[PDB]
Write an enzyme that holds these catalytic residues in place. Sequence first.
Site, mmCIF file in Angstrom:
data_model
loop_
_atom_site.group_PDB
_atom_site.id
_atom_site.type_symbol
_atom_site.label_atom_id
_atom_site.label_comp_id
_atom_site.label_asym_id
_atom_site.label_seq_id
_atom_site.Cartn_x
_atom_site.Cartn_y
_atom_site.Cartn_z
ATOM 1 C CG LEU A 123 72.140 -76.966 13.416
ATOM 2 C CD1 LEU A 123 72.015 -76.273 14.798
ATOM 3 C CD2 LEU A 123 71.498 -76.167 12.312
ATOM 4 C CG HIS B 261 44.949 -96.672 6.138
ATOM 5 N ND1 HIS B 261 46.265 -97.034 5.956
ATOM 6 C CD2 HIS B 261 44.969 -95.487 6.794
ATOM 7 C CE1 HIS B 261 47.050 -96.102 6.474
ATOM 8 N NE2 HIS B 261 46.289 -95.187 7.033
ATOM 9 C CG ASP C 33 47.698 -85.920 7.092
ATOM 10 O OD1 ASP C 33 47.298 -86.302 5.972
ATOM 11 O OD2 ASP C 33 47.302 -86.426 8.156
ATOM 12 C CG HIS C 34 49.945 -88.638 5.200
ATOM 13 N ND1 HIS C 34 48.964 -89.508 4.735
ATOM 14 C CD2 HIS C 34 49.717 -88.475 6.532
ATOM 15 C CE1 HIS C 34 48.146 -89.810 5.742
ATOM 16 N NE2 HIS C 34 48.604 -89.230 6.851
ATOM 17 C CG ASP D 267 75.485 -82.496 11.029
ATOM 18 O OD1 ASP D 267 75.702 -82.022 12.199
ATOM 19 O OD2 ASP D 267 74.372 -82.907 10.592
ATOM 20 C CB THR E 52 48.323 -88.958 10.853
ATOM 21 O OG1 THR E 52 47.798 -89.504 9.634
ATOM 22 C CG2 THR E 52 47.359 -87.943 11.283
ATOM 23 C CG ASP F 11 73.476 -80.340 15.004
ATOM 24 O OD1 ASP F 11 74.264 -80.403 14.019
ATOM 25 O OD2 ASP F 11 73.612 -79.466 15.869
#
EC number: 3.1.4.39
Length: 808
Positions: free
Chosen positions: A689, A265, A308-309, A683, A159, A687
């Site tokens: 990047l 749940h 959210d999921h 990498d 969440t 990161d």
Amino acid sequence: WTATSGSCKGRCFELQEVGPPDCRCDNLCKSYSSCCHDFDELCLKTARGWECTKDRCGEVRNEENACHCSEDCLSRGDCCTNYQVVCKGESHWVDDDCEEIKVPECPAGFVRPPLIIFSVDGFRASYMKKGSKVMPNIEKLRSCGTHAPYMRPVYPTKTFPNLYTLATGLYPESHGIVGNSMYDPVFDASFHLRGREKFNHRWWGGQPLWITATKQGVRAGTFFWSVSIPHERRILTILQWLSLPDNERPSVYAFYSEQPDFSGHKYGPFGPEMTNPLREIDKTVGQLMDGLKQLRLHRCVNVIFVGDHGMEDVTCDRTEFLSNYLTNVDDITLVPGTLGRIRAKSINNSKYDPKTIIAALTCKKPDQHFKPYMKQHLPKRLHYANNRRIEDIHLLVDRRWHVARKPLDVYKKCFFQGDHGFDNKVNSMQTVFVGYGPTFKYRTKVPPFENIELYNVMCDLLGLKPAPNNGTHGSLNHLLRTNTFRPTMPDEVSRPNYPGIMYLQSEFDLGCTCDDKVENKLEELNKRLHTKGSTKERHLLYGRPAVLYRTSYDILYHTDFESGYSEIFLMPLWTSYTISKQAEVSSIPEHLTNCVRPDVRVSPGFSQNCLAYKNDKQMSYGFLFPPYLSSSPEAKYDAFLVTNMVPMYPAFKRVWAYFQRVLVKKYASERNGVNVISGPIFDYNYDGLRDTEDEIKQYVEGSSIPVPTHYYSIITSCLDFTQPADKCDGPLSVSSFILPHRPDNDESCNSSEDESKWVEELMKMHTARVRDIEHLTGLDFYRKTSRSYSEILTLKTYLHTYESEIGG
Ligand SMILES: *[C@@H]1O[C@H](CO)[C@@H](O[C@@H]2O[C@H](CO)[C@@H](O[C@@H]3O[C@H](CO[C@H]4O[C@H](CO)[C@@H](O)[C@H](O[C@H]5O[C@H](CO)[C@@H](O)[C@H](O)[C@@H]5O[C@H]5O[C@H](CO)[C@@H](O)[C@H](O)[C@@H]5O)[C@@H]4O)[C@@H](O)[C@H](O[C@H]4O[C@H](CO)[C@@H](O)[C@H](O)[C@@H]4O[C@H]4O[C@H](CO)[C@@H](O)[C@H](O)[C@@H]4O)[C@@H]3O)[C@H](O)[C@H]2NC(C)=O)[C@H](O)[C@H]1NC(C)=O
Ligand SMILES: CNC(=O)c1nc(N2CNc3cc(OC)c(OC)cc32)sc1-c1ccc(Cl)cc1
Ligand SMILES: [Ca+2]
Ligand SMILES: [Cl-]
Ligand code: NA
Ligand SMILES: [Zn+2]
């Protein structure tokens, strides 16, 4: 301390937060134990319930009532949501035909259409179809507005990481909320669901939508509601705020429901007890839309209905216990459940060793339902590493399972039938998106996209400039009727060299050999043509990738492939080739097995050398354009150029060989040809990047040849597979991967078998977006297509998930 003695009279759900210890009357005051003494009496009225009845119509105003049915209520902004239906003969919103909203139809003094985000916790994507019978209001938003068949959450699919990713556009590793439970070693402080630490601002990085709005002069409702404020009161409060004078009225609002997650749940995602929470959510949407219609705002406001999921079936008896694996179980702290995160129980224990922990957890039982990773080895698509709150050791837990430290943790620290948190490509973790309003498209289905993308759109909807974030701004332009954001392609920073023949073979002392001295203007003109680019249009289909950083590199043309060769890293940044449905796979000739050939376009000083590989007993080499796919015997020599060579561990060459020998051809047959771009990735600081040269931690022994952490491929073809990849007139189709370049295949439990049983499974786990490759390489792909740039952005965000089709 809070001086609770002040009063909420005329301050109910005030928008500015009053500084302690003045008492609070805002929608979060309960959570802080800081409401004024009279908050419940004044601000949380409940008398008479939430619906007008026949007999309340035109009633004399009684201020005690939860909502009103008096004649003055429309202009006071505080009618029951069903007031006009019961008392003025109006229809419910859900009963009206839908009608395209071509332009905003807003009351005077509205400067922009307001945005209302209706977020629902644990709303699994297949509920849209599976519960559609009991959710008519939601079904109408979905069928009349713009919708995706599902929306992908971020990992972990919990969440708080998802709510804040929605709010910021950032991966959890960047925003900082990396789980529902966290330890930050620098603060030496713990974040938990229960408790007050979670309220401390230091956990929350990035810039969420409400702060972005505020900073740019757009007023925001307070997004968060204390748990005891019932849903009906949240809706009424939003509607009251929508009645404020122009100069005081927010333009952006959030409603949040704890359902269906809460019942999910307890009962599982499709428990028969789930029908009621779905009905109740729909009723709350009904209330909101009837309320907007009363205010004449139902064709003015953009509404986002977003989850959210999702939720999976998970029970106590599908728990794996670290105590069945680990000898020293009490020397570790585990964050347990649908993911596992491990650290040392104490920082004073120097007999703590990660490598031994990982080994005791790797492929130890036949059916093992979790897999250990050092965080930097997790699938780059999860972007789950670059944060000190993420423990070095991670367990990816199989869907439907939990991990715990010891069996006592599960009956003294069954109760539950649903949970979530698993890998974000899992079908049952997918959630929902619907956008409805003047700025959204009418009756439009859009493909599945990731929730990191929405912050940019929410900003577009409010005319805000987004803070820097992980969405690819423009990739969701197709959801919108107007306010699209029209991005420019980034400028190339480095221009390539186009080297010709500059070096004689004898200038090279690389310790390489090839049995190639085994050789007219028939072919002699043809080879010159090929080396100057005569076949480039076949192998470079979408333009050359642009280099978006300062570097020195050469373009190298060949009959079968084109490459951008980095003089700094001594290998290509990219290698591009096209394999048609009809191409054939040959083997490496026997006499060419160990052949490596100097490239007379590229100096000895900027070349790899074979001796390094000979001396480095751990490191071998592979080729980026594969010799197996050469168009002819003569062309095959090009594939053995030292400029097409890259370092590979023997264990990885098993993976790479099968991909290049078996799989590229398989995809060309299935997809009617494919264009492949492959290259290295570095990498080392995990990161996401591109590394600079000074970040490289490993070289081929005795040389300056840097060792990639990963190898990528981008496999493009025509979305209409009746057209060959090299003659495609319309939309493209892509899949990509970023394979970890590992010295062992420990990740693959079945690796002692033939690659046909395990390699493709590994490749699927490490499926990637083109965008992830762009971040990792400083390259920009698809610069020359016939497609719109927004369409190409949507392509670059595409993720091939390999899940079965959502539904049944
Ligand atoms: C997803 O999108 C995001 C957002 O664009 C991308 O993340 C950005 O990446 C940038 C480039 O790497 C990074 O830029 C750095 O910013 C440094 C200033 O940092 C603060 O200021 C910003 C601005 O408001 C703020 O947002 C930052 O917030 C981070 O940290 C706070 C507090 O700790 C947290 O609340 C928050 O969660 C966030 O944490 C995340 O980022 C940090 C790194 O910034 C991570 O460490 C965390 O794990 C977490 O992921 C900060 O409060 C700035 O100082 C940097 O400049 C250094 O490097 C440049 C190189 O050009 C150089 O010019 C300077 O000399 C400087 O070097 C000095 O520091 C070095 C390190 O100590 C040292 O080695 C040197 O020798 C020097 O002393 C740099 O510009 C940017 O901050 C983040 N932004 C965010 C929000 O994360 C992300 O990359 C995207 N992901 C992908 C895969 O594309
Ligand atoms: C999955 N959730 C969200 O995305 C989300 N949840 C919210 N609330 C509001 N009140 C609340 C109370 C809670 O606990 C009582 C709570 O617990 C977990 C969550 C919330 S606002 C919101 C949201 C809305 C817009 C944007 Cl841009 C970003 C986030
Ligand atoms: Ca890096
Ligand atoms: Cl967690
Ligand atoms: Na070697
Ligand atoms: Zn939950």
